Design a protein around this ligand. Structure first.
Ligand SMILES: CCCCCCCCCCCCCCCCCC(=O)OC[C@H](COP(=O)([O-])OCC(O)COP(=O)([O-])OC[C@@H](COC(=O)CCCCCCCCCCCCCCCCC)OC(=O)CCCCCCCCCCCCCCCCC)OC(=O)CCCCCCCCCCCCCCCCC
Ligand SMILES: CCCCCCCCCCCCCCCCCC(=O)OC[C@H](COP(=O)([O-])OCC(O)COP(=O)([O-])OC[C@@H](COC(=O)CCCCCCCCCCCCCCCCC)OC(=O)CCCCCCCCCCCCCCCCC)OC(=O)CCCCCCCCCCCCCCCCC
Ligand SMILES: CCCCCCCCCCCCCCCCCC(=O)OC[C@H](COP(=O)([O-])OCC(O)COP(=O)([O-])OC[C@@H](COC(=O)CCCCCCCCCCCCCCCCC)OC(=O)CCCCCCCCCCCCCCCCC)OC(=O)CCCCCCCCCCCCCCCCC
Ligand SMILES: CCCCCCCCCCCCCCCCCC(=O)OC[C@H](COP(=O)([O-])OCC[N+](C)(C)C)OC(=O)CCCCCCCCCCCCCCCCC
Ligand SMILES: CCCCCCCCCCCCCCCCCC(=O)OC[C@H](COP(=O)([O-])OCC[N+](C)(C)C)OC(=O)CCCCCCCCCCCCCCCCC
Ligand SMILES: COC1=C(OC)C(=O)C(C/C=C(\C)CC/C=C(\C)CC/C=C(\C)CC/C=C(\C)CC/C=C(\C)CC/C=C(\C)CC/C=C(\C)CCC=C(C)C)=C(C)C1=O
Ligand SMILES: CCCCCCCC/C=C\CCCCCCCC(=O)OC[C@H](COP(=O)(O)OCCN)OC(=O)CCCCCCC/C=C\CCCCCCCC
Ligand SMILES: CCCCCCCC/C=C\CCCCCCCC(=O)O[C@H](COC(=O)CCCCCCC/C=C/CCCCCCCC)COP(=O)(O)OCCN
Ligand code: SF4
Ligand code: F3S
Ligand code: FES
Ligand SMILES: [K+]
Lengths: 158, 48, 259, 82, 69, 164, 87
């Protein structure tokens, strides 16, 4: 048999209610660039491309339509996710450079033992800082769910 | 005029023992745990 | 016609050490490895150098690495086979010549623990041997038999990495022998000195020491007991005890000692 | 290489040469300085994190339980699943 | 199905002890918890020199020279 | 020192004596012991000097202060010399290569005998300068020379007492 | 160098591989299983006999004009529909 991929219902609403293009802020551009690629063995998660489309559309701030309100809430959730990605790179670089300078005079074995762990720990610290500064720790479960709704869904006949 | 030589690392030739190998596994338990967490973290980000 | 490969190094030439293969007829040679080495030296290449004295296994001068496992050549048996027998000096030691190792550091470490009975009161006049029951004397059975061959010393990976900071299985075994001895009255001083991260706690329980001991002693067992005793008996004042003993050694000559 | 042959070794506590032992002590201070700074992350997470289903939670307490005393009739199947 | 009150102190306290105990154990009791101290002592301690070239010093030195300090 | 704390002479004697034995009883050979503890010794030593200042002529506290200061002088001096020896040993180890095979062997020390001559001269200076700390000097510097003696054949007065 | 199969280096590697690989694969598989459990609930693959009939039905239900929707075949068994006029 065959599988059909179509835009999700929430994607349809966003297209219908968009009024213009939305400028992509500097941190949003860097965040999208630094986001890892997401191979799709199956479709269940938003990738960097889907997030770009969400951030590109512009909605009316004053619109009281419940559907438009959901679109704005989804966009804000995605924005916080994207800008949070900027924290990964600084942590990784500091996680490697700082220990490496500290152990510069020591033998090669020490650098092999210590740097890999410090690199991962630095990245972890960067990701925590990025997500914390992006207001992700205060999002309600509702906002988080909207930001994670898939953009593409397998079509279900009938 | 005379100098003494220094042998290579014994790891390449010294005979192994069952207890010696197990001790290494005991010391590497945490290293493996970190490795697995990293693999799962990567998969959660790059797969599906 | 067994084939013997022997580690060779000329201190004067200082060339890269290499393995040289000799062919010996086991029919005209003694069962033990040391006999093969002597026959090689006597007949084929007299330049070969190695330490040997006892032939009984008691002295411990002929420690070598045969087929990757340390042992005494005089007690080791020749195992004929197609695969050549490889003979090398003790692992991670500075070779003075051919198979003769440089064990000066081992001797220095042994002298550090001060392996002589210490008592607070000198032998009073008219006093005979110190009292010691059979039960107490039995505690030393597995520890006073060490021949100081250093097979265990060079089989411990922790000794490979930190030879100049880690006392090693042999020296730690002897340290506990004096601690366990009932006649000795400086038990706390000895435990305080040995209670060091480098000296004692580099032992990771690998057990390569007990496996290769020619005399069948159990350095790993003794090292484990010493750790348990130290942990239970530690007091805040041990550091001061070490210092006071160091002051008592102020007028000693140069060399390793309690300090 | 050729190590310098005119090193002025330390003579006492007030006439000291700079050696790797002193540099290691500086490492100890810096690594411990990092531990103080990195403690802000876990503390920040606990102080700032919130766990709420939606914005209705606050509205419910404001209108139906302002004093955190109003008892509610319990119906076990709701949160018990069955 | 409609109790007047629900007893939660017992269940909550049990969870607190189980979660707290496991975390405090892993972080306090085991000797394995000092594995990183051992590895550093075995392979990293006192294995340092100032008379051997290393990339971090070379990189800093070249940049300073390039910018004339 | 800037402090408002006050101590009696009995307390000052106890603090000075405790620090003196803590330093002397510590194993100076292990580099990490000095790295970890020296920061604590200096902080205490500053306090001890401040409180023991009026007792520098005291018949009990006075001698303790002199020994404490002398011991700290010897600790720094021995550490500096042994620190240099460790560098020489580390250079020799790296010159062996990977797995001691020479796979990526570095450049050897071309003036090893000169360094041995320099280190032994410093070792002799410590013995003359600190006649009451020979046990500690032999522990750190004397043992270090013995390790070097394995790498290079050089002569020092106490060589025979280290089985060389 | 002198290399032997019964060496500590080689034997340790085999011991480590036997001890850890079975654990790691199980642990990784368990995490993959958890991801699959959430994935199927959020978006389960559904198979359609004919793409054209399904695509027409999709446009009718959502009130989308087929002209402005671009249909492409990513793979043999995968067909994706996208908005033609998308920023
Ligand atoms: C626009 C662009 C341009 C402008 C930019 C902005 C400018 C702003 C200016 C004003 C602000 C300045 C900010 C402070 C910076 C000051 C830095 C400083 O002073 O450094 C001193 C320091 C020297 O001092 P030292 O103590 O002697 O150190 C010796 C060495 O550093 C040896 O060091 P080591 O070997 O011991 O290793 C060091 C390392 C040791 O550690 C490590 O290596 C390991 C690190 C940990 C392991 C894990 C790694 C993971 C890393 C994670 C990173 C974070 C991730 C999360 C964040 C992500 C991003 C969101 O230390 C650390 O990593 C410790 C870090 C401690 C962090 C403390 C944070 C404080 C937070 C305060 C609170 C917040 C603010 C207040 C508000 C509070 C509100 C509640 O200099 C260096 O570090 C330089 C090293 C490189 C040398 C070359 C450069 C210097 C020039 C040398 C020339 C020599 C020439 C000689 C010539 C001789 C012949 C003529
Ligand atoms: C009672 C027992 C208790 C025990 C407790 C012990 C706890 C230990 C905890 C250790 C830390 C683990 C933290 C994991 C956090 C992640 C999971 C998570 O939070 O998920 C939810 C959530 C993430 O899920 P999500 O919401 O779906 O968002 C998606 C991600 O954010 C998307 O993430 P992302 O996009 O932001 O970043 C993805 C991430 C993941 O990384 C990747 O994606 C990597 C991808 C790699 C691709 C490579 C491609 C190569 C291609 C080669 C091609 C070859 C071709 C050959 C061809 C041959 C042909 C013949 O990337 C990185 O991390 C950076 C890159 C990797 C850097 C490190 C590389 C070196 C690895 C070193 C390994 C060390 C072990 C050595 C083993 C040795 C074995 C012998 O987390 C967050 O949002 C926050 C993340 C940060 C949380 C950190 C929490 C830290 C907790 C620390 C507690 C410490 C306690 C222990 C005591 C105290 C110690 C100081
Ligand atoms: C995955 C992400 C994370 C990866 C790792 C990231 C690494 C960066 C961490 C940054 C945080 C701070 C790091 C330590 C700061 C410095 C502390 C310090 O100096 O204290 C004195 C320090 C000992 O301090 P201590 O706190 O009294 O002793 C800790 C004891 O564990 C006694 O501890 P306790 O009794 O207080 O008990 C609490 C214990 C509790 O410990 C734990 O909770 C368990 C952790 C066990 C270790 C796990 C990792 C094992 C990795 C081994 C190394 C890799 C081997 C190679 C493998 C790859 C081969 C390709 O806490 C610790 O062990 C310390 C925690 C912080 C550092 C270790 C973080 C491990 C994170 C593990 C996350 C994954 C957990 C999975 C669990 C799975 C469960 C089934 O001694 C030394 O520095 C010795 C140095 C010897 C070499 C000479 C070096 C030069 C000396 C000059 C000064 C240099 C200072 C810097 C040293 C490090 C240079 C690289
Ligand atoms: C004498 C012994 C001294 C021992 C000292 C031990 C110190 C231990 C330090 C642990 C720090 C743990 C910090 C966790 C992070 C908390 C951040 C946070 O949100 O805090 C605010 C919040 C405030 O809660 P809240 O309800 O207002 O909400 C804040 C916002 N949310 C809900 C999102 C978190 O909670 C706390 O205050 C946390 C508890 C802090 C306890 C810290 C340790 C107390 C040690 C007391 C020592 C008693 C001495 C006894 C002798 C007295 C003699 C006079
Ligand atoms: C003086 C005496 C004192 C005695 C103190 C005794 C302390 C020990 C007691 C154990 C307490 C355990 C508490 C676990 C937390 C509560 C359970 C929980 O949150 O799950 C429900 C939650 C609730 O999920 P939920 O949201 O679906 O719940 C709603 C339920 N329905 C749908 C039916 C309505 O379950 C989950 O989230 C699923 C995952 C559960 C993960 C369980 C973790 C177990 C931790 C094991 C640690 C083992 C460490 C040691 C290992 C050694 C190995 C050799
Ligand atoms: C230096 O000596 C040593 C000590 O001091 C004595 C130690 O204490 C210790 C103990 C220290 C520890 C246990 C600390 C931890 C140590 C670890 C983790 C190991 C560190 C050492 C290493 C990682 C080894 C360094 C890296 C290597 C040797 C590289 C390994 C890879 C190799 C050799 C493959 C390279 C092969 C090639 C380039 C050949 C290429 C082939 C071709 C081009 C053929 C092409 C063919 C066709 C047909 C086209 C060790 C291990 C040691 O080696
Ligand atoms: C058969 C033998 C098995 C033995 C092994 C047992 C392992 C048991 C499981 C792992 C125990 C270690 C702690 C696991 C914590 C997992 C917490 C968790 O469920 O995270 C989600 C949870 C709930 O989120 P909700 O908003 O309600 O739902 C949103 C959907 N996720 O999120 C959080 O609160 C995450 C907090 C992350 C903090 C990270 C830092 C933690 C540092 C302390 C580590 C403690 C480890 C040990 C604790 C004891 C474990 C028994
Ligand atoms: C030592 C090497 C350093 C290398 C550079 C590292 C830079 C790191 C920056 C990237 C990582 C940061 C975390 C990831 C981003 C989180 C998300 C985010 O954008 O956070 C902001 C909030 O987070 C922050 O603002 C984080 C700021 C981090 C920097 C704090 C320091 C600021 C002062 C810098 C002084 C620089 C001096 C330069 C001197 C020049 C002299 C010539 C979210 O708020 P918004 O809703 O977007 O809008 C907020 C305002 N309406
Ligand atoms: S314990 Fe055995 S192998 Fe080690 S020195 Fe003593 S007799 Fe020799
Ligand atoms: S082999 Fe070594 S690690 Fe201990 S158990 Fe024996 S002395
Ligand atoms: S010659 Fe002495 S033990 Fe063999
Ligand atoms: K006794």
């Amino acid at each position: 048999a065959n599988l059909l991929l179509v835009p999700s219902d929430i994607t349809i609403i966003e297209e219908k209610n968009k009024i213009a293009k939305r400028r992509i802020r500097l941190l949003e551009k860097t965040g999208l660039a630094l986001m890892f690629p997401v191979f799709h063995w199956r479709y269940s998660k938003l990738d960097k491309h889907d997030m770009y489309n969400i951030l590109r559309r512009k909605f009316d701030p004053s619109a009281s339509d419940p559907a438009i309100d959901i679109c704005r809430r989804r966009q804000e959730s995605v924005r916080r996710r994207v800008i949070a990605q900027n924290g990964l790179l600084p942590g990784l670089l500091l996680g490697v450079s700082l220990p490496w300078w500290s152990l510069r005079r020591y033998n090669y074995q020490s650098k092999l033992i210590v740097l890999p762990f410090c690199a991962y720990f630095g990245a972890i610290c960067g990701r925590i800082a990025g997500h914390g500064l992006s207001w992700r720790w205060v999002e309600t479960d509702r906002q988080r769910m909207l930001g994670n709704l898939p953009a593409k869904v397998y079509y279900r006949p009938k | 005029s005379y100098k003494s030589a220094h042998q290579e690392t014994p790891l390449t030739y010294y005979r192994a023992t069952q207890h010696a190998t197990s001790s290494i596994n005991h010391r590497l338990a945490y290293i493996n745990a970190v490795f697995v967490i990293w693999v799962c973290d990567s998969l959660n980000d790059v797969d599906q | 016609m067994q084939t013997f490969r022997v580690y060779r190094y000329d201190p004067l030439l200082q060339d890269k050490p290499h393995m040289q293969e000799f062919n010996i007829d086991l029919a005209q040679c003694g069962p033990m490895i040391l006999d093969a080495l002597i026959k090689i030296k006597a007949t084929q290449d007299s330049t070969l150098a190695f330490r040997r004295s006892c032939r009984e296994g008691i002295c411990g001068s002929c420690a070598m690495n045969i087929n990757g496992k340390n042992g005494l050549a005089c007690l080791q048996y020749i195992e004929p086979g197609a695969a050549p027998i490889d003979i090398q000096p003790l692992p991670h030691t500075y070779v003075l010549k051919d198979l003769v190792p440089d064990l000066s550091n081992f001797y220095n470490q042994y002298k550090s623990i001060e392996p002589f009975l210490k008592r607070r009161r000198a032998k009073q006049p008219g006093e005979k041997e110190y009292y010691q029951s059979i039960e107490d004397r039995e505690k030393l059975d597995g520890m006073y038999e060490c021949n100081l061959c250093a097979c265990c010393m060079t089989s411990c990976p922790s000794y490979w990495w930190n030879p100049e900071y880690y006392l090693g299985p042999a020296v730690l075994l002897q340290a506990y022998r004096w601690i366990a001895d009932s006649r000795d009255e400086f038990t706390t001083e000895r435990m305080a000195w040995i209670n060091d991260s480098m000296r004692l706690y580099r032992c990771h329980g690998i057990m390569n020491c007990t496996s290769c001991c020619p005399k069948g002693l159990d350095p790993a067992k003794a090292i484990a007991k010493m750790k348990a005793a130290i942990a239970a008996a530690y007091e805040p004042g041990w550091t001061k005890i070490v210092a006071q003993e160091s002051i008592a050694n102020k007028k000693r000559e140069s060399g390793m000692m309690y300090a | 290489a050729r190590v310098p042959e005119d090193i002025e070794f330390t003579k006492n506590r007030y006439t000291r040469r700079y050696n790797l032992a002193t540099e290691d002590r500086v490492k100890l201070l810096n690594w411990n300085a990092f531990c103080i700074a990195v403690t802000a992350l876990p503390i920040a997470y606990v102080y700032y994190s919130w766990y709420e289903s939606s914005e209705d939670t606050d509205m419910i307490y404001r209108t139906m339980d302002p004093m955190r005393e109003a008892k509610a009739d319990y119906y076990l199947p709701l949160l018990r699943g069955h | 199905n409609k109790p007047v009150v629900v007893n939660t102190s017992g269940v909550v306290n049990t969870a607190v002890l189980g979660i707290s105990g496991a975390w405090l154990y892993f972080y306090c009791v085991p000797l394995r918890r000092k594995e990183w101290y051992d590895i550093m002592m075995d392979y990293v301690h006192h294995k340092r020199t100032q008379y051997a070239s290393n990339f971090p010093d070379k990189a800093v030195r070249t940049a300073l020279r390039f910018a004339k300090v | 020192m800037l402090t408002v704390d006050k101590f009696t002479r009995a307390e000052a004697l106890q603090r000075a004596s405790n620090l003196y034995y803590q330093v002397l009883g510590t194993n100076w050979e292990d580099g990490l012991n000095l790295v970890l503890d020296v920061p604590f010794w200096e902080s205490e030593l500053e306090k001890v000097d401040h409180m023991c200042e009026p007792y520098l002529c005291d018949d009990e506290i006075g001698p303790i202060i002199r020994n404490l200061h002398e011991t700290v002088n010897c600790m720094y001096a021995c550490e500096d010399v042994r620190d240099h020896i460790n560098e020489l040993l580390e250079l020799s180890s790296r010159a062996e290569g990977v797995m001691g095979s020479g796979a990526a062997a570095s450049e050897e020390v071309e003036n090893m005998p000169e360094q041995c001559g320099m280190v032994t001269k410093a070792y002799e200076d410590l013995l003359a300068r600190y006649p009451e700390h020979h046990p500690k000097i032999e522990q750190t510097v004397g043992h270090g020379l013995a390790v070097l003696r394995q790498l290079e054949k050089f002569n020092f007065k106490s060589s025979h007492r280290y089985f060389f | 160098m002198m290399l032997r199969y019964d060496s500590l280096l080689w034997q340790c590697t085999l011991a480590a591989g036997i001890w850890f690989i079975p654990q790691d694969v199980a642990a990784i598989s368990a995490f993959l299983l958890y991801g699959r459990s959430k994935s199927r609930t959020i978006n389960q693959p559904v198979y359609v006999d004919n793409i054209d009939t399904a695509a027409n039905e999709y446009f009718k239900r959502k009130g989308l004009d087929p002209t402005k929707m671009i249909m492409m075949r990513k793979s043999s068994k995968i067909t994706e529909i996208r908005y033609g006029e998308m920023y």
